[model samples]
Target: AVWSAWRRAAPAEESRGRAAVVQKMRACLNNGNAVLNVGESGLTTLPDCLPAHITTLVIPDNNLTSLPALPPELRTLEVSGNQLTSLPVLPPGLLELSIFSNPLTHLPALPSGLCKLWIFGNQLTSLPVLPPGLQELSVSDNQLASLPALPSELCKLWAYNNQLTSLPMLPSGLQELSVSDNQLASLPTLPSELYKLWAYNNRLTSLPALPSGLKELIVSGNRLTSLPVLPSELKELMVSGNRLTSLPMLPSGLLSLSVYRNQLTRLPESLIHLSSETTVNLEGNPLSERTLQALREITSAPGYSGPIIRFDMAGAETRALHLAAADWLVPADRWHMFGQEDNADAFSLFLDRLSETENFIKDAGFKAQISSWLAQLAEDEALRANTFAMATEATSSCEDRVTFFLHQMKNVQLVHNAEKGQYDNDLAALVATGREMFRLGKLEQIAREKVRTLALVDEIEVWLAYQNKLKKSLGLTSVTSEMRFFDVSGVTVTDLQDAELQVKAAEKSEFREWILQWGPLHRVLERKAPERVNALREKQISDYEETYRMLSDTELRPSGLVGNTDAERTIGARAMESAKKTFLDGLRPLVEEMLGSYLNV
Candidate 1:
């Protein structure tokens, strides 16, 4: 029921010895087996004579313009890396299809029986309504203008780089959709069942009212003029790109946000004291210079109780780790704990300055003020998500997947900190007093849980892109876990290489430790439990110190290495060189691992 085609190798490229070798190779795979390969030796086009019994076909990197009929029995087909200008005509019964890097201008209609489709880096203008039972779709880098109505059975949708103008109403079962680069004008009304929505790029003019129980709302690019009223129960809001200015009222229980490239002239006067270091992004806007000054003022002040972010755009997060980021800021005097600088003089100055700001955060009822702020952020994320962004460089690039993720995390952290600031005094008293009021514990528990959840999810968003590379370079399958290296004092290639085992060992150990401590982890802590919590906290602190010590070990230091160097001097003359290396080293490995380990099974 099928036929395949072949062309003879050209002159000297095929030798007598090579011919025999090729013959033997073919003979080895002739009997009911599949041969998947890339490069010129492979077919540039889908062979017209493919056998019906062949279950898998992979002929990538040929740079061909289009694909032909696939074998009907084929369950997996990988025709990525071609210059194909359209979606391939996939065969029936296929469960997996990866035709990425083509110039596909339209999303092909797939069979209902399909499960996964990865067509990233194409020219699609819009997504087709997905077939029932389809589970995953990654149509990034296409020309899609809006999300298509999704199928109920669909679990993941990764259509990041299209011209999507809005998210179509998603099915309740949908889990993820990365609709980053498009003309999306408004937040697509989301199903309550959503787990993640990566709607970073688009033409959003304003944020929509947020869904009550949404998890991730990554709306970076757009012409948003103002944030919508915020949701009380929110996660992340990455409103980075836009022409309009001003932050929406932030919420008390927020997660991440990135307001990076908007027209925000400055931080709103009403903003102060947050619980988490909101990944604030005033970059690419007129607000950056002033915003930075305000942040410096806040950090320099002593009693501020919020998270702040301050990093040069050139090296964002250069100082951040999983536990903390470089851009983190809080109300000054209250931060007797976080910063590493321990000079009493510096602390005195910080406290003195922050004392002057007493009226700024203390005048209003704490919970009410926090509630108002959270409402604003939730509204803003919603408004940003709903508004259609006018297509432009300023709006589109800011909403990029990685950038949006970072900003979203920042917003959520901001919300978290704001809430914590609202309850700081009361919560502290609850810990100090022996009263076993269930209400304070419940609130504390809620805030703590949100903190853990938001931090975990945000970290994943920061690191997920690496899944692609791991599959390509090291043939790794599945990235079930990861670890970070803290070269606090300095870093080097050799130091990095040597730290790999430590990173792995530490991560595994931590996982087990968490498991072993589940009893206490779940136990409700009262005033009496502070001591227990303190002991556990001390253990974590010791572990962190140990990690830093390991990194700082002079004996273990790489040979012929020096302290840190600016990319322009030691690493490379161009910053992009470092970016490229970071991408390949940090991000690629994870991607490769996930695909190799999970894609097949």
Candidate 2:
């Protein structure tokens, strides 16, 4: 039989297994057989006198380490899962070979017209020179330490999981390559046309700047400390589990990032500057608290309060409305006890006194309030003169005593402000100096305000030890009168003890609060010239008007004191007029000098 090997073996093994029928055998098979039918045969070797018509042979999963014979016309052979240590010379027209999972130590030289090779999972250490017509080679999982020179016609290669140290020059027509799990230290600057590269699990220290047109790259599990700056056109990157410390700065429009575990420490702040939405995972890092606060402020929390308040105090005749200052001010209704807490008898008297003084708090609106607050102090010039006249009978030692105390207080304040770094320029220095002078004068005014209040209670007290010589002072005689005005402050000894305790516990701040909240509010602005002028005029014309309206005990202008009568009557009328004119006459010039010398600075 001319097709002895092919025809004889076909019909004998048609046992419903893979039907191996060598039906069409080419004649003039210049070599051995053009086709071979050895499918699942029990024979350990090729049958002798093989037909020359064999063209295809299938001997997969055989324990044979070497093939029996060759068929020159053979175009396809699948010896996959075989024990073959090496592949023999292939037939001339062989176009497809499948030796996958074989023990082949080296790839056999490929025959011409061969286009496909499936030697994956073999023990291949190196690739044989490729045939020019080969288009696909899937030798993945082989022990290949390096790539073989690729054929110009090679289109697809799957050599992943090999021990390859680096990539050889890829052929121009190559489209896909998987060199994953290799020891590749660096990527060759690949051709821009390559569309897919899967080079994961390598020891790549750093990636070669990638090709421009690369489409899908899966370079995970490398030693890459950082990625090269990527081009905008790149689409998919699956670089997880690398040593990347920071991602390269990228332009807008990247498609995806699947990096999961690496050496990433800080992410780029501008990562989302261009694109509107992106998902990033930074579950662990040492980011600072201030940075976190800034992020929270920008993205979540906002709008907080500022310090410092300035309003017109001159208009303030009523109690100052308190803002939160310290811990004590937090509770509600604390202000309801304002008068009692300041040691007044109870509610009615506090309300009556407040009613008289409430004119200082201008409820006419904010501007009018400022104007009225200033108006109360407008009579300061005249009021100071009257108080000074009353105190003149005392020794000059009193003025010296008060002045010394004031200088001490002013110096203490100046030193404190300097230690606190309040002074800077020439103007601030001038204001600081001017403030000390104003404080010295304020001591006099404070004494005046207190002396007037005390004098009203002095009419029934025993004579002062120093004033015993003044018999015209209506010195006390009877015990009842001795005690009547003795301490007519109505503040009993117990009350005075409580007041002293309050002052002691008052702290400097509490004392200041009492002065600001309970004392004459106009006193704050009375030291100013404008307010002093307005107040003096009001005192002359309006103080008596109020006295006439309320108090009937003493007539300021009695019938005996009628004008154009006795000298005393004329003096009384003149006294009223003189008081009206005294304050402004002295104050207007001082205010003008102050404006020119100090305020204008």
Candidate 3:
């Protein structure tokens, strides 16, 4: 008997589409077919008139928000990829229940006979205790901070990509476990029958002794300093992005090995023991000469069939040669790199600054450090799979989903650079435009000063808006009155009482900023009126031309395979986007208003 409190939802608004839905359910008549699949969609709700005799009902990838009452005879029920937030009661005889990829946050009691339960990719924060007979479970990609106790019969567990801080005790017969992208610091003792363990991107520092029969081990992205003696039956070993200074004795039967991006300075000569046709990824390591010499041994051996070795021989040197982004430091340097607006003279400052920032990462202790992100991606199967990004999933492969993948993943500095360039262009545009007011002395001197001051006020407001926006992004916002852009220091209720003659604190800063710009403004506008806008326009044009030229320069990726093309394309795209935003979205609407402010009226 399947029973719970949920009653069938009443159908509503039987318009043309609703009547159209009535036509779809009748197509699957229960003509003694053991299984029924009504997965086609446009289905907002399931009909309560669903036939009761079916043994297995499959309704996946549908738009249904709720399920009708289950048939007591139902042996298996699958309704994954739906809008379900909770499940109805389960039939006591049900063998399998799959409600994965839904919006489900809760589940009813599991059937005693239920052997498999897959409820991955949901919004669930907690799970009920497991039924004794359940053998397999996949509850990954959810908000779970803890899992219910596992039954001894459970053979496989998939709990990856969740917010789990710790896990329940494992069953003795559990063979394969997937618990990546969690916050677990220590793992429970391994079962002797276990084969595959995927526990990357956790806080685990040391691993328990590995079982002898294990084949595939992916423990990349942890704080592991050393690995256990590997099983002789192991085929694929991916320990990339760890802090291992040396490796344990690897199995001679290793088929695919990846130790890239670790701190390994010396590699074991046992690498030559790997058979031909093996694929090795040792990229991103600063390997010593002897280790590279061993890699040469693998390549130069007689009848070397197909061992592809990839490493960053030019990672240090070539990365140093690329020009540090000039505009990148304007604002981000204030925070992340702790740099000035004018650090362009240092040449390799961007790469050198971030890679070696021991102070910001360790001393000040920011949450979003680059090392953690890179290491997180180090054991990322997707990052390992996408060769275009690891830079050597690369080099003339020609077709592995080339995208702005790495650029999006790299850091926020490029977008910061482009955004600051918007402010830079506005100031430059206003400087050129503000100089025009002085040349047109047709207006009285009082009129000229007042008109330009209006423009200056306009600039100050925009400056305050932009600066306030930067503060909000940096999480520096407090009380609105205490905003840095609105700092009202050194002035009290004015004793000098005349309204027109009294200077406010805001206007004082404004006048000083105006004076700072007046020298350059007059220098360019000092020439004849005939050449007024041309010189200003030319200087602005030259400035952008230098930037665009640098953006389009082929020096970084001359042979097309040498550079971080993903990062390069993103910088290029954002630069173009910033230019379009500056001229069109930013300046065009104000151009006429700007012209009006310069008139004698």
Candidate 4:
């Protein structure tokens, strides 16, 4: 009896084990719903699959190497985070598929009704023809060197970290595109409806004209030298780590802007009009001292009266004086006062008070210093003006000098016929004057002038050669020619024929010289004159700069003002403080003293 009972219990135990397996597999479904999520269930295969009525299958984060036949009604399939190298025939009505983080080298033709696809972080070197109904696609972190034709209905695309050299014609309805970390050299025309675009870390030298409706644009870490016009609706603009020397006009609604690691020396004036709450990051730029001061001024404009924070220096005495002077010079209250009627007298009174402060400053034993300041400022202003004038004069004279020099060389043609001796003497004198001017100049001047003179000589030689070629072609000797034509004298005499031949021959010779020499010489002048002029102008600037340095070093240098910048700043600070205190205190007393006497009288 014991042996028979053991045999029966063994079969019952085997049946119970099979029931447990079926229970675990059935638990993959949630209350017999049309969705099965065996994700992260350590599922190596789907031997006990769901019913064909199920519409979604999510088996991601599993050890699946290959998928079984999908349910016929499946519309969304997510097999990501698996070892799927390939997929089975997908359901025909599928709308979304996400198989990223796999080693898929290729994919079968996607379902016709699919609208969203995410196959990023895969080994896909190429993509198959996508479905027409696809709306959103993400194939980033792949080895794709190029993209196939995308669907027209697609709106969002993320193709980052790929080897793409260029993008295909974008869909017109695309709104968000991120092709960053690619090898793109240039971008194609963007869609007008695009709102967000990020193409950073590429070899792009420039961007196409941006659409107006765009909002967020980040094209940093590239070789961009300049940006296209920005869309006014843009909110965030991050274009750092580029070769940009300047920026385009920013939009008023821009809320966040980062343009660091560039060669910008100054920002756009429109930046002052942006909201004070806007965050601007401008680190790693080569800003100049003048530009920094201008930035401070703009940041302190009417709307931007926030905390005056600075990165480089604290409120030192020098800065305090500079700020005080700037405030006193262009006080905000002045504008408010100017806006009201009968404020002209008040404005004049303010000016009078300022003038009295000047008097007090003079009487404070700083008259000499004040005069020195005035003199130095005037001298420096003149020197700067001279520098600018010198550059402009040289640049302007470049073309004119070329014209004159060409005419001078061609003047040789006129020397033989009209006033040859007088022309030669005047030419010789002018040449001597030019030589002396150059000799008194620097070595650079001499070298540049010589280069120009030699180039002109070379051009002249070429012109002569061209003239010779034309002479040979025309079968002429002595660079002169003659011809004969009938002169209608009506007298019909033989002697008249000889006179006509003589006159015609002379006329023909004149025409020949004009044709061969005139055109050739002018052409040579047009070709070689610019280079000569440029060289000469460069020398002129160098000479002027040398003279300017000498004057500043000797005669133009100020007395009792020879000190470092910090020391000079300290002196100016003391003057500014003294002027401020005296202006405010002396005003009330002066008014009272004047009013008391007037009333008493």
> Per-residue lDDT for 1-601 in model 2, tens only?
5334434554344422322322322232454544544545333334333444566777745446577456666778887566777766788788898877777788666887889988888788878788877899898888887777777888888888888887777777777877888888887766656778889998887777676766777898887777887766666667776767677765455555555556554445444343323333322223344543343343322332111111111110233222111111212233333323322222222222222222223233423432332232123433322322322222111222222222232243443333333442233453434433333333334333333333112211212211111212222110011111122222234533443343334332342222222112222224444466566657767754553333222443454333324644545565555554554455445434443343432
The positional error of residue 76 in candidate 4, measured at the CA in angstroms, is 0.7
Question: Which one is best on TM-score?
Answer: 3
3 or 4: which has the higher TM-score? 3
lDDT of 2: 0.49
lDDT of 4: 0.56
Candidate RMSDs in order: 24.5, 40.0, 21.5, 35.3
Model 3: which ten-residue window has the lowest total lDDT? Answer: 396-405
Query: 32 in model 4: Cα distance from truth in Å?
Result: 5.5
TM-score: model 4 vs. ground truth: 0.48
For residues 1-601, what per-residue lDDT tens digits would candidate 4 score against the true structure?
Answer: 3323322344453444334434543564436677766535455555534456778787757666887678789998887687888888888899998887888888888988889999899999888898887999999999999999989899999999999999999999999999999999999999999999999999989999998899999999999989999989999998988888898998999888877677787778776667756767665576676776776565546656322221211001112222222233421232232323232332223222222332334344433432332233233433323222222211111122222222222232232212222222243332233222222222223223333322012222222222222333332222321111111101123433443344335444543222222222223222434464345445545555554444445533464333455545554455445443443343334323322232220
Cα distance off (Å), candidate 4, residue 333: 68
Candidate 1 Cα misplacement greater than 4 A, ranges: 1-35, 38-47, 63-69, 85-89, 106-109, 125-129, 145-148, 229-235, 241-257, 260-277, 281-305, 309-601
Q: Residue by residue across 166-285, what tens digits does model 3's lDDT show? A: 778889888998999999888888888899999989887778889888988888888888888899999889887788778887788889888877777876766756775566776656
Q: Which candidate model has the greater lDDT, 2 or 4?
A: 4
- Estimated TM-score for each candidate: 0.44, 0.41, 0.52, 0.48
Using alpha carbons, what is the TM-score of model 1? 0.44
lDDT of 2 at 77: 84
